[PDB]
Amino acid sequence: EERVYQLLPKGDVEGMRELHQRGMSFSPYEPTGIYVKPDEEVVIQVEGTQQIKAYIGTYSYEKEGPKQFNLHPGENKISSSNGGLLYFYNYHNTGEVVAKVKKGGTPNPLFILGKHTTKDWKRMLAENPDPYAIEMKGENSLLTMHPETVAEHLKQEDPAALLKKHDEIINIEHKMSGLSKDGAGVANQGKHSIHFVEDWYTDDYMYATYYRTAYSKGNLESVLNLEELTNDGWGPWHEVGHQHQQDTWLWDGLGEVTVNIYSLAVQTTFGHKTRLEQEGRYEAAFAYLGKPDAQEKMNEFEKLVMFWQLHLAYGDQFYPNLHQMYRLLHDTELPKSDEEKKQMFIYMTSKVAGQNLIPFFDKWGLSANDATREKIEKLNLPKLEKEIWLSTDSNPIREKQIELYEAPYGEPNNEKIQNMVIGTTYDEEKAKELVQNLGEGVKTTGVIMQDTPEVGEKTVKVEIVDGKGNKNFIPVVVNVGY
Ligand code: NI
């Protein structure tokens, strides 16, 4: 009756979040399929050297949030007044960690894509009738659902096809973010999945926040019905989009705008006409072209037009390259205000495009200041040849297709998780030893950056450069001290 988990090293959700410049973390959960009752003591044994974290409870599934646990190697006795599902968090980057649940707890359906069969699923449901929850785990996704809700909306013999679709969507949004499984540094999507939670304790419709996206009662059809997710899945696409938004070009007014760049990505990828096109949002937005107050007048879907136009105009690679370029910014060049984010966006997009985009932004009433004009002027980029502010999906206006940014490769070095005096931004020698297996032509620059300077043992970013002059930041764990 001992249940053993081989917890892979996943790294830190907060780490990833900061490296990505995203507003909220991905899920830290590795599910166990073990429900633990209120006040039930669970005996769990951690083998090997490394310590890990654990949770009793599921974010957004109960009224009260999950209780959290630090597991020292050897024997532990954890317990929650509220009970809940058990999850493990091997937040380290190196070393698999074996955790054994010796006593306490009871089985709860957990279906893992690529591990379980239709037979296992059927058996699972029959053996654990009317359980606390249903959990379904894909490569990139986790679903924590009420059982009556799965029984109503799952239209397949097993959850496999559904998980594959959810993973497909998540990967599309990762891709749009210039983030991949293999990529190093600013291209690394990280090892954490996206969590979808049926939340019976909110009046909100759907929402996204740290660790998970959640869906209030009666609103789960497009998360659980494969055809609805595929064909009419805006809600979940959008909430996943929120977890993807990067704050560095998220000024006031864009919170409910840029999220839908990801949604439109999924929507067009699945072969559907854009919500923009269906809602006549283009013609509605064009009524403001050349009007100076356009940004104050346009609604959130109107403003979405401009952003999507750049996608149509340059490549599927536009937003992938834009995301990465923003992640390469040094501390002093991170935009500190709404106005700065705006001036920065005009500059950064022009560089990704390799064209002076000012006339385009001018049309949308996003005015470059003279500093931004001159700064783009010094780039000697060709002018816009077409009128891309008039672009629609049905009549797209395309400039040159741009290729994907090739980020230089490099790795951390955990040999010696090392010492650093806080606020160091350049150490030629230390930098060379924080990284390893760099690529060809590639070398450290000496630049070192800590996004939120805290003390002790946190991820710092080590800058690298290749023969071309393309940069990357490699995250590594360090001791930061006085
Ligand atoms: Ni939203």
Side-chain angles (χ1 to χ4, degrees), residues 1-481:
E1 46 179 290
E2 150 184 299
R3 309 81 95 187
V4 300
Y5 300 83
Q6 282 182 334
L7 313 169
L8 266 39
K10 290 305 193 192
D12 189 345
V13 298
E14 178 69 342
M16 286 326 295
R17 185 196 61 82
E18 290 202 297
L19 312 186
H20 296 174
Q21 294 173 354
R22 281 181 306 98
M24 66 202 77
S25 299
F26 290 152
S27 181
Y29 284 172
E30 257 266 326
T32 58
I34 294 171
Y35 175 72
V36 13
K37 311 165 207 113
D39 307 331
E40 193 187 4
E41 205 192 71
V42 193
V43 185
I44 182 253
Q45 168 82 11
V46 191
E47 304 195 318
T49 32
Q50 272 163 4
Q51 50 159 5
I52 48 165
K53 304 186 102 76
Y55 300 80
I56 299 184
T58 304
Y59 284 106
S60 294
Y61 192 70
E62 287 99 19
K63 200 182 182 197
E64 276 156 51
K67 261 59 165 167
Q68 190 167 357
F69 304 90
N70 296 318
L71 306 183
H72 55 77
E75 223 213 36
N76 305 263
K77 289 187 177 190
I78 56 190
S79 158
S80 175
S81 126
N82 293 335
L85 291 168
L86 177 69
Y87 304 92
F88 280 127
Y89 184 17
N90 193 358
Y91 59 88
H92 306 284
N93 276 259
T94 44
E96 308 189 6
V97 171
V98 169
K100 311 183 159 182
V101 188
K102 260 78 168 296
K103 212 160 228 47
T106 201
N108 190 80
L110 167 60
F111 182 93
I112 295 134
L113 171 67
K115 180 176 180 182
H116 294 116
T117 59
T118 317
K119 264 179 132 297
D120 296 297
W121 170 247
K122 254 68 191 299
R123 182 180 49 169
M124 233 185 285
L125 295 180
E127 285 191 344
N128 318 287
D130 305 303
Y132 183 73
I134 297 313
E135 296 196 303
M136 294 159 282
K137 186 218 185 293
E139 305 283 85
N140 295 105
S141 49
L142 178 62
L143 278 62
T144 304
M145 300 290 180
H146 283 78
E148 39 283 298
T149 308
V150 176
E152 159 178 32
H153 286 126
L154 184 57
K155 304 305 195 190
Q156 293 76 232
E157 291 308 290
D158 63 54
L162 205 241
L163 294 167
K164 291 191 210 118
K165 190 60 60 177
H166 270 289
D167 288 341
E168 191 170 346
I169 301 177
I170 295 161
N171 281 293
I172 295 168
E173 309 209 358
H174 284 359
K175 182 163 169 162
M176 274 279 128
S177 299
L179 292 182
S180 88
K181 184 163 152 57
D182 289 344
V186 305
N188 177 239
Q189 68 180 39
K191 295 175 203 151
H192 306 104
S193 304
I194 306 288
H195 197 181
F196 302 72
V197 189
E198 181 172 12
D199 179 351
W200 287 6
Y201 301 95
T202 183
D203 292 327
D204 276 42
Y205 169 67
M206 301 169 185
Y207 65 89
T209 182
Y210 275 75
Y211 314 135
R212 77 301 190 167
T213 64
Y215 311 79
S216 61
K217 168 128 95 154
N219 293 304
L220 277 294
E221 173 176 76
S222 74
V223 180
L224 288 188
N225 186 319
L226 172 64
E227 206 195 318
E228 285 305 294
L229 180 60
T230 310
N231 279 359
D232 195 36
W234 189 273
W237 308 343
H238 182 89
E239 298 310 324
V240 181
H242 273 322
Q243 287 213 318
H244 278 85
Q245 280 172 298
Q246 53 174 179
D247 291 331
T248 48
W249 48 283
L250 207 173
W251 57 85
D252 206 31
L254 293 195
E256 292 299 346
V257 186
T258 52
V259 50
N260 287 323
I261 296 170
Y262 309 98
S263 305
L264 289 173
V266 180
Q267 188 173 41
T268 45
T269 295
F270 288 168
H272 314 322
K273 285 72 254 171
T274 67
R275 186 160 189 178
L276 296 175
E277 180 173 337
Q278 296 205 337
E279 297 180 352
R281 246 73 210 230
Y282 286 108
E283 290 312 301
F286 298 170
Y288 298 100
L289 290 161
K291 298 304 182 244
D293 50 353
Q295 296 293 311
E296 203 159 53
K297 297 308 173 164
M298 293 189 289
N299 57 38
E300 291 154 3
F301 268 78
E302 270 144 14
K303 296 220 252 212
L304 176 57
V305 164
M306 169 183 68
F307 293 97
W308 190 241
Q309 282 179 345
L310 295 169
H311 177 257
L312 294 172
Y314 292 100
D316 278 19
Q317 313 306 337
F318 180 85
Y319 279 102
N321 296 0
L322 185 74
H323 281 75
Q324 298 181 265
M325 205 182 71
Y326 269 101
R327 303 183 185 114
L328 299 174
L329 291 176
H330 294 201
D331 57 346
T332 58
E333 57 195 13
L334 292 162
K336 292 298 168 176
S337 73
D338 283 345
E339 186 52 47
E340 290 190 312
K341 283 165 172 173
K342 286 166 185 158
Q343 294 306 316
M344 183 95 322
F345 188 77
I346 300 179
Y347 172 62
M348 300 284 279
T349 62
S350 300
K351 281 155 74 206
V352 168
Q355 279 181 297
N356 186 333
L357 289 178
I358 291 164
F360 172 76
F361 290 105
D362 276 351
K363 277 303 175 67
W364 283 122
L366 205 46
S367 193
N369 65 41
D370 303 289
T372 303
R373 300 179 116 85
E374 185 163 17
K375 182 189 187 179
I376 290 162
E377 204 44 63
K378 283 151 152 185
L379 292 167
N380 246 320
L381 304 171
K383 71 175 186 180
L384 274 162
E385 212 51 49
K386 320 300 202 11
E387 310 190 2
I388 60 171
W389 50 96
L390 286 171
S391 193
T392 56
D393 296 292
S394 64
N395 302 99
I397 316 304
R398 312 185 188 286
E399 294 281 4
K400 239 209 57 205
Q401 249 206 329
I402 59 165
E403 311 112 354
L404 175 65
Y405 181 62
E406 257 196 83
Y409 181 79
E411 301 182 9
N413 185 244
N414 48 114
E415 217 159 33
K416 57 258 269 152
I417 277 176
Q418 222 159 329
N419 278 26
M420 162 136 50
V421 42
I422 225 191
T424 312
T425 60
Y426 187 100
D427 198 329
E428 267 166 358
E429 290 315 291
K430 193 138 300 170
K432 304 187 165 162
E433 291 129 39
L434 290 169
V435 290
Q436 95 201 6
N437 281 321
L438 312 177
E440 241 260 82
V442 180
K443 63 179 189 245
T444 180
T445 68
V447 176
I448 298 189
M449 215 79 265
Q450 185 178 19
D451 291 323
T452 50
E454 337 139 54
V455 97
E457 289 231 289
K458 183 60 219 286
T459 293
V460 184
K461 307 191 287 179
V462 183
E463 182 181 68
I464 59 174
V465 67
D466 63 26
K468 336 293 130 110
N470 298 348
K471 268 85 174 282
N472 207 345
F473 273 130
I474 301 302
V476 347
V477 185
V478 180
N479 170 282
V480 205

